[PDB]
Amino acid sequence: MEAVLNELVSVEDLLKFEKKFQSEKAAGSVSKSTQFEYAWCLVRSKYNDDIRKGIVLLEELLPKGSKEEQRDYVFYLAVGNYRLKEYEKALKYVRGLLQTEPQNNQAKELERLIDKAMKK
Amino acid sequence: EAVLNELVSVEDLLKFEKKFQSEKAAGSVSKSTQFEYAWCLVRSKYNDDIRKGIVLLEELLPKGSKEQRDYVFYLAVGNYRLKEYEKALKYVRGLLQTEPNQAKELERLIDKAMKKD
Amino acid sequence: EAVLNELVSVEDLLKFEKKFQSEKAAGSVSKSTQFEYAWCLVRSKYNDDIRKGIVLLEELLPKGSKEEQRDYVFYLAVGNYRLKEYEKALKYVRGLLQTEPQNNQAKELERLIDKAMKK
Amino acid sequence: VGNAEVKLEEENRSLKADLQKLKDELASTKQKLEKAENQVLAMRKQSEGLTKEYDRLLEEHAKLSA
Amino acid sequence: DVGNAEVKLEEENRSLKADLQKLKDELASTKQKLEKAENQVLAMRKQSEGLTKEYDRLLEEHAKL
Amino acid sequence: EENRSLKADLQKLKDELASTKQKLEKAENQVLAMRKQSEGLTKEYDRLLEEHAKLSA
Amino acid sequence: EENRSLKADLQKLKDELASTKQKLEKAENQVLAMRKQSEGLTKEYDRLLEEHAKLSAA
């Protein structure tokens, strides 16, 4: 199943990106792209602690981001909060991102998913 | 095809929003571009999109060249899609009085949807 | 619902044709009106309409700006796909995808053209 | 002294001739420049005509490709 | 008259000496205050560096909950 | 001294002639660019001619 | 006249004192901005405190 390939590639990504992140943290500052790579692997992982670590890394990178970079960070924060079923924070990030980009179809479908899950 | 319709709808929404913002950054927004944006918006499947389209159409309504008939028609459509049937009927009646020959089936639909509830 | 879709398609074709002729009679036709008209022609169910819309889009190609020519090429691909002119549809969509490699809408359009070509 | 006046009048008539030649060359250059401007004007006219030509040629090519 | 003029000379003279002394004292006070203001600002930037990590840990705990 | 006024006028004339020479050379470069453009139009028109001949056969 | 030297040095002293007055004005502007940011920190912290206490009161 595609799920087996996905899980094995997830394990490889997690290992190698954690290695790069830790190598950069041990020797001086960690670059923004490496921290983003790590958080991006983390929020797509199947472990919820991994998604939490990715959300933390994205929130830490958020203030020292550029223009497009903070929009990407907010998109992935919405994704991560959606996956942890923290639908309000997901809705906050996706509504902010859609306020700065009204017709990003991906963030519109993401907010659609969050709203569909919020109705209980 | 539903896929073709969805893809062209997303492209229209994206690119006309981009044109709207590009023209808004540098001075006034053109009437034709804002109409295109609002009309794509009222044809969208997201309710917020129809709300934005109705707002833009109403803001094109005052200083129009009589095309106010199209603006009122699309306002009726947008209000109908949001289940705001009254304004749909009001705009469709205004347009029908200005034209003795479209929107009659729109009136039919508004009335049947008011009868359904 | 579908009835509403049909009624707005009919209103669009009629009134945009009317405005096209109104601007054609008195001097130059605006590019926005011609684009609206072709936008409607390529959505009609008559193949002659899609042919006319493709003609208007090709006429509008040199007059468009950087982003307008991309939209024109997108709709040329759409119109040729709908007329089963898969060669020209593929050509325009690949031209467009060279300047925007990850426009997912044009990727799904090319995929529709390819699946119809292999069938 | 008389030699000096003779030389003076020599340089004098030479100066008159050189001034005449400069005036003539100026007139000729000016006429040539203005006719060049007329040429350029006609060319811009034909450029706009070429725009119309391209409009019609493109319309025919599109109607034939369809 | 000489007498009055030399008296006035020394009067202006001692007055100038006093004004210069006062100017020097006020200069010393202002410089000292500026210097310790710089000291405060340095400590404050240090506490800003600390506040960054404080916010990081706050985020990590909020996420853990 | 009329000769001094003459020589001042002549120095001004030399300056203005230098300036007209530079403007002439620059107009020449602009016309050369327009000629490059006309040649480009010519070649593209020949290609379109071949295309039209293909469409006619 | 070395009294004129005193007068010229005092003119320079007045110039530099105007510069120092503008110095303190500008430094006060910067400190005021720092104050505004500190107060924003405090208010945001208070809102976070309310949220944390609400989570605790569960």
Author numbering:
A (entry chain A): 1 to 120
B (entry chain C): 2 to 67, 69 to 102, 105 to 121
C (entry chain B): 2 to 120
D (entry chain F): 170 to 235
E (entry chain D): 169 to 233
F (entry chain G): 179 to 235
G (entry chain E): 179 to 236
Task: Show me the paper's own sentences about this structure.
The outer mitochondrial membrane protein Fis1, known for its role in mitochondrial fission, has been reported to interact with the ER-resident protein Bap31. Fis1 is a single-pass integral membrane protein anchored in the OMM through its C-terminal transmembrane (TM) helix. Bap31, an alternative protein binding partner of Fis1, is an integral polytopic ER membrane protein. Fis1_ΔTM exhibited the six antiparallel α-helical repeat bundle structure known as the tetratricopeptide repeat (TPR)-like fold for protein binding.
The presence of both Fis1_ΔTM and Bap31_vDED in some crystals was confirmed by sodium dodecyl sulfate–polyacrylamide gel electrophoresis (SDS‒PAGE), and a crystal structure containing Fis1_ΔTM and Bap31_vDED (residues 168−233 + 234SAAA237; denoted as 168−233 + SAAA) was determined. The crystal structure contained three molecules of Fis1_ΔTM (chains A, B, and C) and four molecules of Bap31_vDED (two Bap31_vDED dimers, chains D−E and F−G) in an asymmetric unit. In the asymmetric unit of the crystal structure, two Fis1_ΔTM molecules (chains B and C) form a dimer with an extended α1 helix. Two individual coiled-coil (CC) dimers formed by four Bap31_vDED molecules (chains D−E and F−G) interact independently with two Fis1_ΔTM molecules (chains A and B) in the asymmetric unit. The remaining Fis1_ΔTM molecule (chain C) in the asymmetric unit did not interact with any Bap31_vDED molecule. The C-terminal region (from Asp224 to the C-terminal end) of the Bap31_vDED helix in the CC dimer bound to the convex side of Fis1_ΔTM, which consists mainly of α3 and α5 helices. The concave surface of Fis1 did not participate in the Fis1−Bap31 interaction. In particular, there is only one salt bridge and only one hydrogen bond between Fis1_ΔTM and Bap31_vDED: between the side chain of Lys64 (chain B, Fis1_ΔTM) and the side chain Asp224 (chain F, Bap31_vDED) form a salt bridge, and the side chain of Lys89 (chain B, Fis1_ΔTM) and the main chain carbonyl group of Ser234 (chain F, Ser234 is Gln234 in the wild type (WT) Bap31_vDED) form a hydrogen bond; when analyzed with chain B (Fis1_ΔTM) and chain F (Bap31_vDED). Since the buried surface area was only 273–361 Å2 (~3.4–5.3% and ~4.5% of the total surface areas of the Fis1_ΔTM and Bap31_vDED structures, respectively), the interaction between Fis1_ΔTM and BAP 31_vDED is likely very weak, explaining the impaired complex formation in the SEC experiment. Interestingly, although Fis1_ΔTM + Bap31_vDED crystals were grown under acidic conditions (pH 4.5), the C-terminus of Bap31_vDED had a defined helical structure.
